[model samples]
Target chain A: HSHRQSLELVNPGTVENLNKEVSRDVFLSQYFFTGLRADLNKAFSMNPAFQTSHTFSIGSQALPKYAFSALFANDNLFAQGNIDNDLSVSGRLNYGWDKKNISKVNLQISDGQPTMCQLEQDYQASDFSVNVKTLNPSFSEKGEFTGVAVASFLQSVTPQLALGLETLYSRTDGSAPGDAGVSYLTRYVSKKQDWIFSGQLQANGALIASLWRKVAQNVEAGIETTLQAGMVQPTVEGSTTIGAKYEYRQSVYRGTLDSNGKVACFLERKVLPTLSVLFCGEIDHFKNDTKIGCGLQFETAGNQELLMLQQG
Target chain B: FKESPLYTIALNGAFFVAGVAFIQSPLMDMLAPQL
Candidate 1:
């Protein structure tokens, strides 16, 4: 599990402003999260075993100049079997700020957020996939949309130890304008001590895939090395990445970018047997070069089963 | 002794050990001679 936060203030702003209409003094803020996961396995038959997992996360964020705060929650329930590991079904639910006031000081009217918030579902039976979800806010700038479908495949003959080649098509908000791209992921991991690295490469107005790595009882790290690309929103920026992060505890971290060179770090820590914390901070050398930030984690797992996987 | 006293560690340990044992047990080997 994990949590993180980040705050950015660009004083003079860049010479060539991307969004000129937007205030140069716009303060960028983000809140990160994740927590509480339980994986239970049972042998149903001689040749088939059942695997199930439950995961939940909650968090919130605030974009300066925006009147109201934004909140987000994610939960997943999965069930799989040895008979067909490739054909597994899972359920997903995501909640975010739906009715927050997004108007600024200059605006006289209050703009209500999208109002269709509901549970989401995910189904994966092989190289093909699909997901349908409902978002509270609409998709019109200040609003969010509902339902998304993601489908892709793995190219045969990828290195077993190195990153495997995979690709998928994502259609969020609706099926009209979909995004297609390729991703490089590692083979399935089965041990507590293992390393798995992966990244996605996008095309058709999409960003490239980054990198993910898990060190033996040491660290799980992700690095997105490339130039700034694509629109910046809920969508992760150029350096957006997530994975098992610190070695001390079964935690994870997400590293994203605000713009070219401007980096951000957010981490989720399992502080105690039952409690967890999320935090985020800015990277100084973002404008000049990619900046790396190191953080600490704390945890205590007693009696309870604690399992760490290199890939999810 | 159970890892938790109320529980039976011997039985639990046996199960754990047996679980690992099944990964390469004689019975399993007999079923799949090629293995």
Candidate 2:
């Protein structure tokens, strides 16, 4: 009886999620940029996790000018919506059917672009995991299939090793030509649990490799590289990036170096219990340009009861 | 949990000797009476 539970398939977690540690964890891509930004968030409750936000930004092409966002999350459900000054709207919903199954919906509406919607499902088992999603899946009266579907499965082969496969399928019109392909992935962790490595090889002839290491108690480093090679279609381009994260008592810093002659850094410091200041800068050696950004954040409890407990 | 040909061979040899002693009891009884 005891061995039966131990032999059950345990989930390997989201596919290729650990492979992106260099960019998502140590790099400044998501946290830093060249712009003026401000954010204010007031929490209404904590039991159900309800919060509303106002974000203001300027001087960035990719960043929105103004937005209002509200989020509600509970044990089994999550809902979040955002509306921009330009009337661009986006929303997300996640519903947990049971302990091992989850379904998701995502939608986007923009002024100058077509509407988009996506559906996703996740199944996590004892030793394996599965994910399936479709983009803009639409049914036409002509019996046409006009969307993309992607599915993936990851199985834990050993205690420290996991292997996975991702399949892609797409069709533009009912009678239109279709495209299909598959990708392979692998992930491994060290016995000491100090390092993780992952690799992905795509059907398009792209190979990506990444590794993350814990340098010290408060320091982490990561490196990632990508190469593309094809026999039928041949063009070669490669890039490598190295990044590091440093944490202190009340401040955090991120620095990155890329093969494209770009150096970037982001720093966040807490001046008060509910206030934080952010600074980011980047230098492009090839373009001989420099950009800097700074922002402030304020968070306060909407109710006084939690505010007293928050300090303790 | 672990499978090996050598273990199987050793196990069968042990059983063979045990059964040999069980059948040799007839001669032991005959010698005891003659003595």
Candidate 3:
């Protein structure tokens, strides 16, 4: 999958100045499908199948904290076939001090959707829906990076919450699009005691600006349930002054889709010296989907190395 | 495979150094800036 050449000069008390090397590499992959079930009355139930996929990658790492990587991939499905290829030269400069603060910078240029899977089909625009119409003045028509600075405030509120803030500054490079955003976030300790919220304002520097907000509440009443909601909107779409009216929503109420009420519950009790029993249930309000599953855990005793068995 | 020959060559040169100069120390002074 690769080829190379190298040279070095041999001289005493003299710098070894020599013309060095060259190399090339190529890679590939393949896959198959298998799974079937047919009815006795139906002679031609369904025998639909297809196999199509191949990819190649070349890598290099001569620069400081920067390497070059390129790839090409293809896939052939039954109804639709697509071949996606791109040459992306990307690099990462990662720096950290005391493991508490870290910084990373990355840049990549690619063509044909960048990923092999992306070439297969056209992604639905509805798949990405957001609506952000709020009463806050600071909420800009442009969407913002909602995690960066908010991380410090969240850390001050909860040591358990996993959240951060980020900001993106986009610029137009000829035929490419230009975009920029500033985001903010805040986490609460308990739904019964606090709240979690995040927001972003983004501007495409085109015809419209957008805003978004995600709010959630994590309750700690033995049931350990969480509720989340978010929305995004475009400030100006065209000529008409139509504010952001689009919306995307999701939630889990009561015992889940199986039980009733937009609420859920769980029961717990110590069953043995190192074991416990837990029961849980939920109810869905929209589609009415319900599922229940449980398991038991066996722990090791102190002064014994059995606990190390859980790790490598 | 040969459109960007110089770029490809540079990429390979970088990778060659990556293989031989395997990270000997988790905290390499070569990468760290000393104050």
Candidate 4:
């Protein structure tokens, strides 16, 4: 304990989280789709962190029309449940054994569709972590197992550099065999955390490289390139995406340009403490297509005690 | 780094919002709401 008093090693975080570091933050990569949407959240309690929310959207084929969610979280546990108007339920439960270990369960059930479940465990230490997860593991018949098992380990080599690897094995219920592969990754944090350079090797003729830089106090820029081969070590194709994020006094904007001819941006601005607005736009240059979406959000509390509390 | 569908639009939200509400032209008075 005393040794750590003067020196502390940095956690490398999980391999999955570190895999796509740069572009994930700079890009409008959170599925910037087109549609009008509204969200409402009412929290009745704050100590245990209990809340419910509803999201309603229009003009989107990929998103549900209406969805509801409830969440309960505390120091050691987190539970979330989401239901759709179409009658499907998805849920996640994470229990922390301590600050460094967690058990997680995720599942979804819907009509006329296969039930999905993910069982996962994570162990994080001062400078390293190992994560294991399996999706819908089951013994359907005598010949085998059905599911995907993934494991990863990451460790910080220095205060500024971390590297890791991940393995994935997927098996089907049929007599056929499963597939497996290993991937390598590395992340570098430069002086004063001004830059992050990340690389990934899929080990199957694919490579992904990315880097992000803090352009200013309010701006960040990043670029990512993915190169993959064809068949039988055939021709290699590559695409690069450049992204930037802007932050101002009351607004945040993220946008990206792809080598494939797609451009996108998302903006969130605060109009008031209890209200905000969102906008998303995208243009497919090659397809000559444009999409626009906008929405407003509001929040309210139930009692005077809560009303006195401004932000959540 | 994770923003739920609902994010604190004010990244430094509490400081920015409540400061303004208290720093507003007429929202709060020194003689008001002593807790």
Candidate 5:
């Protein structure tokens, strides 16, 4: 009998998407590993093409790990791969990478019908790291080599403190106005106290801060807030938003409020070892509008059986 | 005044230069081993 890998239901008030995936290792060997994953998205039934992915891995005790995967959806093909090396470097490449119009940050491409190649490289040191990513690196897309390049550098001041900077540069054809942006990030963690704080400041005069702390062994909470002073872009100034989240083991609850007089709450609960449910509610107090949604998920994996009521 | 873009850029540049100049500083001596 086949087993259920995982199931997820997303209901965002206006739309609901249910996703179920099942995967198993069809072949495993010392030097090669192969797997097949089948996925179903309940949101779309128009084209009615099977969605499945095949994954292959090549590695052994003496060799570095390399993985490649290909997915087909509605007769369209997408490919991705990753390679890990002992030289403190890793690389990823993706082709035909349009899935749900997902925003891919590693590559630079414009809107509307994007078929391009993306490559990224990461170098990690004990206390410092650098990452460089390029979209359409092969110049496959039309218009005089259209693509974007991003570079990021980070350094750890101490084991618990780190800071980094990221910059993005993009060009659309030779005549398009080039885009450049930069942001700075800082993070601090206190493992002994189970506390974390992170912040980001962007050149456009936006600031975001977040903090998380463990209240109890099974309880954790966090809050994130964003402020847009619009120092660089005066049109977007004087807006702020805050979001708070709480988690108890496998369950999560969240609430958010924005400067536009809108409030929202999201709750997720794991009712059984193989079942979970979610609820989301939104209210625009200024506009007098309300939205609510509910979702449910079920899993067949016994490994995830929750031991909540068992005898000690 | 210090919040201006040019001032911020210069400050970051100074910090970078300081980081390079003090690459072998005692701060690194204290933190390197912990890593």
Candidate 6:
């Protein structure tokens, strides 16, 4: 099969780690479980090499109109909860507006200091998106303001391309610079839709470029690089190192490998109409690190129907 | 080799814009995700 035809079989909802470094837009397009969800998701990624730093997390969207998750790691407990509302119809056109509010808190079991809190609000529109967030505005760390405010905006110039910008403002008690930096991002896909390119330019003079292409019937490859030039110490004087990735899928077996000396493979076997067993393994050749894990995923009653339906 | 900041930025911008235009035209459906 040709490259373009192969992509047609991909399920948009299935999380593809291969696209993680593709572009800021592609990265943001996949929710990283940040804010409240980030903590719990982090637990799932605990490196096996650090056995003592075990972590456990529980999350639930079980409640209608509400979702929450919590994690416990290294004597520290973190929790986040959020609620979302759609003011317009959840119709096929994806019109109207959707809003979400989240609150998270971190508690230390050993320290007597007060818990840290953060709040974030997100608004999504058919062609535009915005986010406003703040972290522990009332606190300070090491004489520096412990609080920060961040805002981000993404605008779809067309169905095939998008532009985004994000800024971070810190509270420095007038001693340090408050406005840290701004980042500009953009993403575009090729006419055949078989190729994608994304880039970012940061105020600090750091630049990133990401490129991905479908190379074969069941194979996809991508390369990414970062370059830096600025007042920063140990200036990155030339093209930084590059990372490349390859992913393959055939029947129930899926595998991925990257240039960073990391290799991972996965298998998904269906055991029932609504359940499947997933096994995953990863090995870091350079670090001599390995991880193996498995889990069972249950599909809701309407998952199959939704999966077969294409978004218009 | 690395290009100057202004040069690299311009090159990236031009390449990205050209990519966007390429996918939008009738040449192919490159702008949309096939899978």
DockQ each: 0.01, 0.01, 0.01, 0.02, 0.03, 0.07
Candidate 2 wrongly placed segments (more than 4 Å): A1-10, A229-233, B1-35
lDDT of 6: 0.45
Compose the digit string of candidate 4's lDDT tens values, residues B1-35: 76532232223233333333332224323322333
Give the per-residue lDDT digits (tens) of candidate 6, residues A210-248.
666554444444445455666543344323222222233
A best-first ranking of the candidates according to their TM-score comes to 2, 4, 5, 6, 1, 3
Clashing pairs in 2: A9-A126, A9-A127, A10-A126, A10-A127, A11-A126, A144-A174
Worst 10 residues of 6 chain A by lDDT: A87-96
lDDT of 4 by residue, A1-312 (tens): 787545566987677676354546777666475689888877767778888888888997766899899999998999999998788898999999988899999999888556888999999988889999998877765747678889988888888999888888898654668888899988888858877778888778677777776666777667776666666525566667777687787888888777768888889998887787899999999998998888767776666666677654
Of 2 and 6, the candidate ahead on TM-score is 2
Location of the lowest summed lDDT over 10 successive residues in candidate 3 chain A? A19-28
Chain A only: TM-score per candidate? 0.35, 0.93, 0.27, 0.91, 0.55, 0.50
Task: List ranges where model 3 is wrong by over 4 Å.
Answer: A1-165, A168-175, A187-261, A285-289, A300-312, B1-35
Q: In candidate 6, which residue ranges exceed 4 Å CA deviation?
A: A1-116, A124-127, A138-146, A157-159, A172-175, A213-221, A227-254, A298-312, B1-35
Best by DockQ: 6
DockQ of 1: 0.01
Per-residue lDDT of model 3, residues B1-35, tens digit only: 55442443344334433422332223222332232
Could you tell me the TM-score of candidate 6?
0.47
Best by TM-score: 2
Q: List pairs with backbone clashes in candidate 4.
A: none
Cα lDDT tens digits, model 1, A1-312, are: 123112221122111121121111112222332222222222222122223322222221211111211112222212221211222222222322222211111111112332223333333322322333333323445343334323333322222322233344444655366565554433322234233223333444333333333332343333333223334432232322222233345455544444234556566576654345555555546356432222222222222223221111
Whole-model lDDT per candidate: 0.31, 0.77, 0.24, 0.76, 0.46, 0.45
